[PDB]
Amino acid sequence: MLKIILPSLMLLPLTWLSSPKKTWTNVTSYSFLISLTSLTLLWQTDENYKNFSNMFSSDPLSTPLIILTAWLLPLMLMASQNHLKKDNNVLQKLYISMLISLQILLIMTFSATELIMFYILFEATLIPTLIIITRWGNQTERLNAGIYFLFYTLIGSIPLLIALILIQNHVGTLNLMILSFTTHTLDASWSNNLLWLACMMAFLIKMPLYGVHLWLPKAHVEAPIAGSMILAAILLKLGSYGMIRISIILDPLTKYMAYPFILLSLWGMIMTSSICLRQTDLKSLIAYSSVSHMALVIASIMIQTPWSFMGATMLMIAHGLTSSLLFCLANSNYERIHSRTMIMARGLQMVFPLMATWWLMASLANLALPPSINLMGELFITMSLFSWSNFTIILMGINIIITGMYSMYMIITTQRGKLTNHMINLQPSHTRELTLMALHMIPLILLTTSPKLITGLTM
Amino acid sequence: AFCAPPAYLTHQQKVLRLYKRALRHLESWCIHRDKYRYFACLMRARFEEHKNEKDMMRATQLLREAEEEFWQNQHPQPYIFPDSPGGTSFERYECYKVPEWCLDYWHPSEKAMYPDYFSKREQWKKLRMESWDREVKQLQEETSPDGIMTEALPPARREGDLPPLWWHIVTRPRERPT
Amino acid sequence: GYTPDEKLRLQQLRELRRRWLKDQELSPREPVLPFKAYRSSLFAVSHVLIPMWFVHYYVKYHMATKPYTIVSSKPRIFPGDTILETGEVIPPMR
Amino acid sequence: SDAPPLTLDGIKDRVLYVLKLYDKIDPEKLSVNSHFMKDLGLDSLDQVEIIMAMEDEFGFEIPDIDAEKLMCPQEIVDYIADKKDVYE
């Protein structure tokens, strides 16, 4: 693992000790080499989970997340380039340093033998994402968005610390395979019910479902593109890796404590898909789309089917690549028009032919294409929830109706149409942006081709 | 389209609008041209009451009665044209309609692919930049200071100058391109 | 009717539109660029025969050597036939 | 499409060809620069009936806000030419 962690830590003198003309090319080329050396975790020739050291372990569910972190770092450092073409050198290198440090601690959070190391590097994300959002955000409400993000996640994460230290002083070591194998069943006690709520509330805030979903669209319309891609594509699902790894302690209580969170998840995903039908901001529309696609996997890990866990992990990496591509397209439209309203910029296919093709592929992976991992994960979650209850399929059917309607509503609004002709400043699409969405989409096509890597923890 | 609507439709304008809607919803109904010409001269045998009406309250009452008759006997699917709105080809050829600011963003390889046309477009842009500083001064002196301002733009009063607000009219793409 | 103030604008603008469309005409030198069923026989060699070679190599030697993937329906056996594989005859119908 | 483009003299000959086929138009009186109200003496219906003649002649729709203003064959030729966007 340390061949992935420590040269990512040695990317910091690559940022701070090079010429300011050459920071972007050296850091992007060596971070693509970080992703190439982070493809080494796929050497599972057996069901024995890879444990390189007592510090770090590799899991089959955690390895497409770990290639998505090391692959998401150069996709953020591409997209920050014309975002930071006017800022000066030490703020540019501080942005690259905060992005690289976020990548380092996300790699180290996904490689966690011990759950309190997971909590340390789980709450270590809350500083550099706040540095990205509340300094380089382009609107007024980024202070309120940073306060919302920071305090939603800390008021979730404080009883996670309480329940982790209580579980540790109850049973011994918080190592994940130790507490997988030596553990006992939990008695049906009300203190254990409050332990369930305390250890689950951090991940229940980090994955947005109703009651606690509201920090995500503020910290997506007030974020930059690298903060929005990290908060839409791996750092939101760091809590989903935690929600997967917590539940092995406490599986006997989930079959009666599961019901309000599946309820709030399903009615939150119907109402957030209904929210996205009438939205002005395109980044807010992709943000509430991420809320609905996270409420699906909130229901999927609140049930403990193995089928659900495969559909969960498939929805993790499909939602991360699809929402990262959609937010990159929203940043491209924001770069052209200096606004994020979908209504004011229509008919863009007449001037951008291939950006219409990447818009079509991103929103037609958001609308879940059948060989893609989006309908593969959603169909396996539909299988598991119909195994849970036979009357639940109308709710997710209404959700898939309105997700088709908001995806093709965003295509028909911002791509097809009359071509608004009051914009001279629709400059043609950059080679950066076209290869950035190509390096988003071509991993989704190869992941469609080989879905054996993405099967998760449980088959 | 090329002219401008008024603040209010007059009685003659509403009567001729009813005549136009009547003589297209007829031939939406009476499909054959013999029935169209017989019922169109029956519509002239219906206009002959409205010729010398002098009160104008009774003319607006007859306008309301004829409009209620038109909405009662109107076609559920009216006659539509390929170039009309609600039609077969209403803004069908918008794949062509990419305006003249997008030719500024062409590569120099594609600009050298068309030598003389870009030199003549440079001449048209020179005509724009030498006409605009007298075009925008013309509107601020032909603008009336009173509270009523019309929609129709003034022409070129000065000899040798272009009309004001000319580029968005003169550089629309063609409606039937190919 | 038509007022002459709008008529002068429309006359000058229609002259400018005729000038703009005659300028949008292309010059004759302006775009500068850098047998019977023989192509049908060439397509029948280069896109029928060689993909039949590739897909037939696939079907006979990567597919049919792996089991339970090319499974035929049972062909119909009638009273009066003789199956070549074991040499037996079917008894005739009544 | 397979339809030929329309010349100015062809459009003028087509507009004059429909306009001489009206019953209350003298073809020797009819020139291209003659006003419908004060030079051929027509009524309020006949101008919009000339507009319906151009509607079923040229296969496109003239709006009524332009069609009230159109009053003579020369700018009905120039309006039909500027709507179909012909270079001469």
């Binding site: 032919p353 080679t431 | 062509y96 990419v98 997008c102 390889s109 594609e110 063609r174 | 469309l21 292309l26 | -």
Partner: peptide, 13 residues
């Protein structure tokens, strides 16, 4: 029948 210039965005990029 002389060819009219088709107007088109920059396909080089």
């Amino acid at each position: 029948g002389k060819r009219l210039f088709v107007v088109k965005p920059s396909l080089y990029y």
